[PDB]
């Protein structure tokens, strides 16, 4: 019921980590499609996180913030691109 | 690294609040299309937030979580 | 095993149609609660069906897929 | 647009395989909770699949149909039960 500002922040951070989980398992969900649809993507998330750290006095590169959001160097992730969609796996890769 | 657990929490929470704000301004983006593309929507966000509070020992209703994500009662947003 | 690819297709399709039928009769179960519990709902089913048709070379609209899953126009079900 | 009965069946089977994927990745989603909520679970799916095979003249045990739905012997799956929820992983297993 009655929650502290430290609880609100803990719940925001944790829900953010749930989102990150989720975008990592929906590796098929393209950033451009996210961009086109929703005006953000995993890159906007990395940038906003960078902005937050820089405002807190923590210097951080584009690629450091991306490793945080992606869970691996962004290069390791986007070269793990080339792969069938969930609906194409289901259609052709099973029976 | 040199970034403590509590710095991460700060940055993760700020980024979440910025997402929330950005979804409030992109009110033209339908939960349905977010769901069909990405497998989550504003209702999933409210659900994950509620589940986070529960996981931390704080019970919370479906409507409380939605108030938080939407920045208003859900039914007022539904308009 | 002794069960061919085409037997599987038969059985998988029949089980899907039985699920569909069972969700039509459990119209008291809200898409929202299905979504918050299981991470899918009747709208995800319609979306997956549309994506299956697309994956097979057949374009299909959001409303066509929903007609199939709901057994009626979505808006008529929304009532 | 205009689709054959063989296409309808192919799309039903494939959407069923997408569901099965999904329930396998949401291994945290309990059958009882599914039962309580929705009047079905992964066991009802196994049973219906069994009924369909038996009607097609294919004998199949309770446990064979379950291996089909679960993707592994049901024993290997339910002993891989005891594990933190997604929200508890996010809360306590990260920073
Ligand atoms: Mg972006
Ligand atoms: Mg959702
Ligand atoms: Mg859904
Ligand atoms: Mg059941």
Short mmCIF file of C-alpha atoms and ligand atoms in Angstrom, two decimals:
data_model
loop_
_atom_site.label_atom_id
_atom_site.label_comp_id
_atom_site.label_asym_id
_atom_site.label_seq_id
_atom_site.Cartn_x
_atom_site.Cartn_y
_atom_site.Cartn_z
CA UNK A 1 0.00 0.00 0.00
CA UNK A 2 2.08 3.05 1.31
CA UNK A 3 5.45 3.00 -0.34
CA UNK A 4 8.65 4.94 0.12
CA UNK A 5 10.53 6.83 -2.59
CA UNK A 6 13.34 4.23 -2.20
CA UNK A 7 10.76 1.39 -2.84
CA UNK A 8 9.37 3.26 -5.95
CA UNK A 9 12.91 3.52 -7.31
CA UNK A 10 13.70 -0.16 -6.54
CA UNK A 11 10.47 -1.17 -8.36
CA UNK A 12 11.28 1.03 -11.37
CA UNK A 13 14.79 -0.41 -11.62
CA UNK A 14 13.48 -3.96 -11.31
CA UNK A 15 10.73 -3.49 -13.89
CA UNK A 16 13.41 -2.03 -16.14
CA UNK A 17 15.48 -5.20 -15.64
CA UNK A 18 12.35 -7.28 -16.55
CA UNK A 19 11.97 -5.31 -19.77
CA UNK A 20 15.65 -5.95 -20.55
CA UNK A 21 15.21 -9.70 -19.97
CA UNK A 22 12.27 -9.61 -22.28
CA UNK A 23 13.91 -7.72 -25.13
CA UNK A 24 16.87 -10.14 -24.87
CA UNK A 25 14.58 -13.20 -25.29
CA UNK A 26 12.65 -11.49 -28.12
CA UNK A 27 15.97 -11.16 -30.03
CA UNK A 28 13.79 -11.55 -33.17
CA UNK A 29 12.11 -8.15 -32.36
CA UNK A 30 13.98 -5.66 -34.59
CA UNK A 31 14.97 -2.19 -33.36
CA UNK A 32 13.87 -0.55 -36.61
CA UNK A 33 10.45 -2.14 -36.31
CA UNK A 34 10.39 -0.91 -32.66
CA UNK A 35 11.55 2.53 -33.92
CA UNK A 36 9.00 2.66 -36.78
CA UNK A 37 6.20 1.48 -34.46
CA UNK A 38 6.98 3.13 -31.12
CA UNK A 39 9.62 5.89 -31.49
CA UNK A 40 12.10 4.04 -29.32
CA UNK A 41 14.22 0.90 -29.49
CA UNK A 42 17.03 -0.78 -27.54
CA UNK A 43 19.32 2.00 -28.77
CA UNK A 44 17.11 4.77 -27.28
CA UNK A 45 17.18 2.77 -24.01
CA UNK A 46 21.01 2.65 -24.13
CA UNK A 47 21.14 6.35 -24.84
CA UNK A 48 18.76 7.31 -22.08
CA UNK A 49 20.74 5.13 -19.68
CA UNK A 50 23.91 6.90 -20.88
CA UNK A 51 22.25 10.25 -20.28
CA UNK A 52 21.29 9.21 -16.78
CA UNK A 53 24.80 8.05 -15.93
CA UNK A 54 26.41 11.16 -17.47
CA UNK A 55 24.03 13.36 -15.39
CA UNK A 56 25.10 11.41 -12.33
CA UNK A 57 28.74 12.19 -13.10
CA UNK A 58 29.58 8.81 -14.60
CA UNK A 59 31.23 9.08 -18.03
CA UNK A 60 30.09 6.26 -20.32
CA UNK A 61 30.53 5.65 -24.05
CA UNK A 62 27.84 4.73 -26.58
CA UNK A 63 29.14 1.15 -26.58
CA UNK A 64 29.36 0.75 -22.78
CA UNK A 65 25.73 1.72 -22.38
CA UNK A 66 24.83 -0.73 -25.15
CA UNK A 67 26.61 -3.62 -23.45
CA UNK A 68 24.44 -2.79 -20.42
CA UNK A 69 21.14 -2.87 -22.31
CA UNK A 70 22.02 -5.81 -24.63
CA UNK A 71 23.81 -7.95 -22.00
CA UNK A 72 26.78 -8.52 -24.32
CA UNK A 73 28.92 -6.39 -26.58
CA UNK A 74 26.51 -5.05 -29.20
CA UNK A 75 28.76 -6.57 -31.90
CA UNK A 76 28.34 -10.09 -30.45
CA UNK A 77 24.58 -9.42 -30.48
CA UNK A 78 24.01 -7.96 -33.94
CA UNK A 79 26.27 -10.54 -35.62
CA UNK A 80 23.99 -13.07 -33.87
CA UNK A 81 21.44 -11.31 -36.15
CA UNK A 82 20.49 -13.83 -40.24
CA UNK A 83 18.15 -16.09 -38.23
CA UNK A 84 14.60 -17.36 -39.04
CA UNK A 85 11.63 -15.61 -37.35
CA UNK A 86 9.57 -17.45 -34.66
CA UNK A 87 6.78 -18.01 -37.17
CA UNK A 88 9.18 -19.41 -39.79
CA UNK A 89 10.80 -21.74 -37.17
CA UNK A 90 7.29 -22.96 -36.27
CA UNK A 91 6.34 -23.42 -39.87
CA UNK A 92 9.31 -25.14 -41.42
CA UNK A 93 11.66 -26.30 -38.69
CA UNK A 94 9.73 -28.95 -36.82
CA UNK A 95 7.69 -31.85 -38.22
CA UNK B 1 32.52 -2.05 -12.53
CA UNK B 2 33.48 1.21 -10.83
CA UNK B 3 29.67 1.50 -11.05
CA UNK B 4 28.10 0.31 -7.81
CA UNK B 5 24.80 -1.66 -7.40
CA UNK B 6 23.18 1.51 -6.21
CA UNK B 7 24.34 3.57 -9.17
CA UNK B 8 22.85 0.89 -11.49
CA UNK B 9 19.54 1.05 -9.64
CA UNK B 10 19.53 4.84 -10.09
CA UNK B 11 20.29 4.62 -13.79
CA UNK B 12 17.89 1.71 -14.48
CA UNK B 13 15.07 3.46 -12.61
CA UNK B 14 15.70 6.75 -14.46
CA UNK B 15 15.70 4.99 -17.83
CA UNK B 16 12.41 3.24 -16.91
CA UNK B 17 10.82 6.56 -15.92
CA UNK B 18 12.00 8.07 -19.22
CA UNK B 19 10.42 5.13 -21.11
CA UNK B 20 7.19 5.68 -19.22
CA UNK B 21 7.21 9.37 -20.07
CA UNK B 22 7.95 8.58 -23.73
CA UNK B 23 4.98 6.15 -23.91
CA UNK B 24 2.74 8.81 -22.36
CA UNK B 25 3.72 11.21 -25.18
CA UNK B 26 3.44 8.50 -27.86
CA UNK B 27 -0.23 7.92 -26.93
CA UNK B 28 -0.84 7.22 -30.69
CA UNK B 29 0.93 3.85 -30.24
CA UNK B 30 -1.61 1.17 -29.39
CA UNK B 31 -0.99 -1.42 -26.71
CA UNK B 32 -2.22 -4.05 -29.24
CA UNK B 33 0.49 -3.15 -31.80
CA UNK B 34 3.19 -2.97 -29.16
CA UNK B 35 2.04 -6.41 -28.05
CA UNK B 36 1.89 -7.94 -31.59
CA UNK B 37 5.32 -6.58 -32.45
CA UNK B 38 7.33 -6.79 -29.20
CA UNK B 39 5.39 -9.25 -26.99
CA UNK B 40 4.83 -6.55 -24.32
CA UNK B 41 2.75 -3.35 -23.90
CA UNK B 42 1.81 -0.71 -21.26
CA UNK B 43 -0.34 -3.40 -19.59
CA UNK B 44 2.71 -5.75 -19.40
CA UNK B 45 4.77 -2.90 -17.94
CA UNK B 46 2.09 -2.31 -15.24
CA UNK B 47 1.98 -6.06 -14.63
CA UNK B 48 5.77 -6.35 -14.30
CA UNK B 49 5.79 -3.40 -11.90
CA UNK B 50 3.11 -4.97 -9.75
CA UNK B 51 5.05 -8.30 -9.77
CA UNK B 52 8.21 -6.36 -8.75
CA UNK B 53 6.46 -4.83 -5.81
CA UNK B 54 5.07 -8.31 -4.81
CA UNK B 55 8.51 -9.87 -5.18
CA UNK B 56 9.74 -7.24 -2.71
CA UNK B 57 7.13 -7.90 -0.10
CA UNK B 58 4.67 -5.14 -1.04
CA UNK B 59 1.17 -6.16 -2.17
CA UNK B 60 -0.23 -3.94 -4.91
CA UNK B 61 -3.42 -4.01 -7.00
CA UNK B 62 -3.76 -4.14 -10.77
CA UNK B 63 -5.14 -0.58 -10.82
CA UNK B 64 -2.37 0.85 -8.56
CA UNK B 65 0.26 -0.56 -10.93
CA UNK B 66 -1.62 0.91 -13.91
CA UNK B 67 -1.93 4.35 -12.29
CA UNK B 68 1.86 4.32 -11.94
CA UNK B 69 2.61 3.32 -15.56
CA UNK B 70 -0.13 5.40 -17.20
CA UNK B 71 0.21 8.49 -14.98
CA UNK B 72 -3.56 8.40 -14.57
CA UNK B 73 -6.38 5.96 -13.89
CA UNK B 74 -6.40 3.36 -16.75
CA UNK B 75 -10.07 4.11 -17.64
CA UNK B 76 -9.30 7.82 -18.00
CA UNK B 77 -6.49 6.83 -20.40
CA UNK B 78 -8.84 4.47 -22.26
CA UNK B 79 -10.49 7.77 -23.36
CA UNK C 1 8.06 -42.02 -34.57
CA UNK C 2 5.62 -44.34 -36.32
CA UNK C 3 3.73 -41.01 -36.34
CA UNK C 4 4.33 -39.20 -39.62
CA UNK C 5 4.74 -35.40 -40.15
CA UNK C 6 1.26 -35.33 -41.55
CA UNK C 7 -0.29 -37.14 -38.61
CA UNK C 8 1.36 -34.57 -36.28
CA UNK C 9 -0.07 -31.72 -38.33
CA UNK C 10 -3.53 -33.30 -38.01
CA UNK C 11 -3.23 -33.76 -34.27
CA UNK C 12 -1.66 -30.32 -33.62
CA UNK C 13 -4.32 -28.60 -35.72
CA UNK C 14 -7.14 -30.50 -33.95
CA UNK C 15 -5.75 -29.62 -30.53
CA UNK C 16 -5.50 -25.94 -31.57
CA UNK C 17 -9.12 -25.95 -32.78
CA UNK C 18 -10.17 -27.54 -29.47
CA UNK C 19 -8.31 -24.79 -27.57
CA UNK C 20 -10.05 -22.17 -29.67
CA UNK C 21 -13.43 -23.73 -28.95
CA UNK C 22 -12.62 -23.92 -25.22
CA UNK C 23 -11.69 -20.20 -25.14
CA UNK C 24 -14.96 -19.37 -26.91
CA UNK C 25 -16.88 -21.17 -24.13
CA UNK C 26 -14.70 -19.66 -21.37
CA UNK C 27 -15.68 -16.13 -22.49
CA UNK C 28 -15.53 -15.14 -18.75
CA UNK C 29 -11.71 -15.33 -18.97
CA UNK C 30 -10.31 -11.92 -19.86
CA UNK C 31 -7.55 -11.47 -22.40
CA UNK C 32 -5.84 -9.15 -19.86
CA UNK C 33 -5.65 -11.89 -17.18
CA UNK C 34 -4.51 -14.50 -19.66
CA UNK C 35 -1.83 -12.03 -20.71
CA UNK C 36 -0.72 -11.11 -17.12
CA UNK C 37 -0.55 -14.76 -16.12
CA UNK C 38 0.69 -16.61 -19.24
CA UNK C 39 2.21 -13.89 -21.46
CA UNK C 40 -0.30 -14.64 -24.26
CA UNK C 41 -4.05 -14.14 -24.92
CA UNK C 42 -6.69 -14.51 -27.71
CA UNK C 43 -5.06 -11.48 -29.39
CA UNK C 44 -1.64 -13.24 -29.32
CA UNK C 45 -3.25 -16.37 -30.77
CA UNK C 46 -4.76 -14.30 -33.64
CA UNK C 47 -1.38 -12.63 -34.11
CA UNK C 48 0.50 -15.94 -34.21
CA UNK C 49 -2.02 -17.31 -36.71
CA UNK C 50 -1.60 -14.29 -38.96
CA UNK C 51 2.23 -14.63 -38.70
CA UNK C 52 1.88 -18.35 -39.60
CA UNK C 53 -0.07 -17.53 -42.70
CA UNK C 54 2.54 -14.83 -43.65
CA UNK C 55 5.39 -17.26 -43.01
CA UNK C 56 3.67 -19.59 -45.51
CA UNK C 57 3.31 -17.04 -48.23
CA UNK C 58 -0.28 -15.96 -47.55
CA UNK C 59 -0.90 -12.32 -46.59
CA UNK C 60 -3.67 -11.90 -44.01
CA UNK C 61 -5.08 -8.91 -42.12
CA UNK C 62 -5.33 -8.40 -38.37
CA UNK C 63 -9.14 -8.67 -38.53
CA UNK C 64 -9.12 -11.86 -40.67
CA UNK C 65 -6.87 -13.56 -38.11
CA UNK C 66 -9.17 -12.37 -35.30
CA UNK C 67 -12.32 -13.62 -37.06
CA UNK C 68 -10.66 -17.05 -37.19
CA UNK C 69 -9.66 -17.16 -33.50
CA UNK C 70 -12.79 -15.52 -32.10
CA UNK C 71 -15.30 -17.22 -34.41
CA UNK C 72 -16.80 -13.79 -35.03
CA UNK C 73 -15.75 -10.22 -35.78
CA UNK C 74 -13.57 -8.99 -32.84
CA UNK C 75 -15.86 -5.96 -32.20
CA UNK C 76 -18.91 -8.22 -31.93
CA UNK C 77 -16.97 -10.26 -29.33
CA UNK C 78 -15.93 -7.06 -27.53
CA UNK C 79 -19.69 -6.93 -26.65
CA UNK D 1 -6.84 -13.97 -49.05
CA UNK D 2 -8.64 -17.19 -50.35
CA UNK D 3 -7.26 -20.16 -48.50
CA UNK D 4 -7.64 -23.90 -48.85
CA UNK D 5 -8.70 -26.30 -46.10
CA UNK D 6 -5.13 -27.74 -46.23
CA UNK D 7 -3.70 -24.18 -45.63
CA UNK D 8 -6.17 -23.60 -42.69
CA UNK D 9 -4.98 -26.86 -41.13
CA UNK D 10 -1.28 -26.03 -41.71
CA UNK D 11 -1.84 -22.62 -40.05
CA UNK D 12 -3.66 -24.18 -37.08
CA UNK D 13 -0.89 -26.73 -36.57
CA UNK D 14 1.79 -24.05 -36.83
CA UNK D 15 0.05 -21.66 -34.43
CA UNK D 16 -0.27 -24.62 -32.09
CA UNK D 17 3.50 -25.16 -32.34
CA UNK D 18 4.00 -21.40 -31.54
CA UNK D 19 1.88 -21.79 -28.43
CA UNK D 20 3.96 -24.81 -27.41
CA UNK D 21 7.20 -22.83 -27.88
CA UNK D 22 5.74 -20.13 -25.74
CA UNK D 23 4.56 -22.31 -22.88
CA UNK D 24 8.01 -23.97 -22.87
CA UNK D 25 9.78 -20.58 -22.47
CA UNK D 26 7.26 -19.46 -19.82
CA UNK D 27 8.25 -22.52 -17.74
CA UNK D 28 7.49 -20.27 -14.72
CA UNK D 29 3.76 -20.23 -15.75
CA UNK D 30 2.17 -22.90 -13.51
CA UNK D 31 -0.48 -25.32 -14.81
CA UNK D 32 -2.61 -24.90 -11.69
CA UNK D 33 -2.61 -21.14 -12.13
CA UNK D 34 -3.53 -21.75 -15.82
CA UNK D 35 -6.22 -24.22 -14.62
CA UNK D 36 -7.59 -21.86 -11.93
CA UNK D 37 -7.57 -18.92 -14.36
CA UNK D 38 -8.54 -20.46 -17.71
CA UNK D 39 -9.94 -24.00 -17.28
CA UNK D 40 -7.08 -25.54 -19.24
CA UNK D 41 -3.36 -26.10 -18.83
CA UNK D 42 -0.54 -28.00 -20.54
CA UNK D 43 -2.15 -31.21 -19.29
CA UNK D 44 -5.50 -30.45 -21.01
CA UNK D 45 -3.48 -29.78 -24.19
CA UNK D 46 -1.74 -33.18 -23.84
CA UNK D 47 -5.08 -34.85 -23.26
CA UNK D 48 -6.80 -33.22 -26.20
CA UNK D 49 -3.84 -34.17 -28.39
CA UNK D 50 -4.17 -37.74 -27.08
CA UNK D 51 -7.87 -37.69 -27.89
CA UNK D 52 -7.13 -36.51 -31.40
CA UNK D 53 -4.53 -39.22 -32.00
CA UNK D 54 -6.76 -41.95 -30.49
CA UNK D 55 -9.63 -40.80 -32.78
CA UNK D 56 -7.24 -41.06 -35.70
CA UNK D 57 -6.45 -44.65 -34.75
CA UNK D 58 -3.13 -43.91 -33.08
CA UNK D 59 -2.87 -45.40 -29.56
CA UNK D 60 -0.94 -43.07 -27.24
CA UNK D 61 -0.42 -43.07 -23.47
CA UNK D 62 -0.87 -40.15 -21.07
CA UNK D 63 2.92 -39.80 -20.86
CA UNK D 64 3.59 -39.98 -24.63
CA UNK D 65 1.20 -37.12 -25.27
CA UNK D 66 2.86 -35.16 -22.47
CA UNK D 67 6.33 -35.60 -23.95
CA UNK D 68 4.84 -34.10 -27.14
CA UNK D 69 3.40 -31.01 -25.44
CA UNK D 70 6.30 -30.48 -22.97
CA UNK D 71 9.14 -31.28 -25.40
CA UNK D 72 10.78 -33.63 -22.90
CA UNK D 73 9.63 -36.39 -20.59
CA UNK D 74 7.25 -34.68 -18.17
CA UNK D 75 9.41 -35.97 -15.29
CA UNK D 76 12.50 -34.15 -16.63
CA UNK D 77 10.30 -31.03 -16.85
CA UNK D 78 8.53 -31.01 -13.49
CA UNK D 79 11.73 -31.88 -11.58
CA UNK D 80 13.15 -28.81 -13.37
CA UNK D 81 10.34 -27.17 -11.30
CA UNK D 82 11.98 -25.09 -7.18
CA UNK D 83 13.15 -22.08 -9.24
CA UNK D 84 12.74 -18.31 -8.60
CA UNK D 85 10.00 -16.43 -10.52
CA UNK D 86 10.95 -13.89 -13.26
CA UNK D 87 10.12 -11.03 -10.90
CA UNK D 88 12.25 -12.50 -8.09
CA UNK D 89 15.20 -13.07 -10.52
CA UNK D 90 14.87 -9.42 -11.58
CA UNK D 91 14.67 -8.23 -8.03
CA UNK D 92 17.39 -10.12 -6.24
CA UNK D 93 19.60 -11.86 -8.78
CA UNK D 94 21.28 -9.05 -10.67
CA UNK D 95 22.96 -5.92 -9.29
MG1 LIG E 1 15.50 3.80 -31.00
MG1 LIG E 2 0.90 -6.94 -23.06
MG1 LIG E 3 -1.55 -10.97 -25.73
MG1 LIG E 4 -5.53 -28.44 -17.36
#
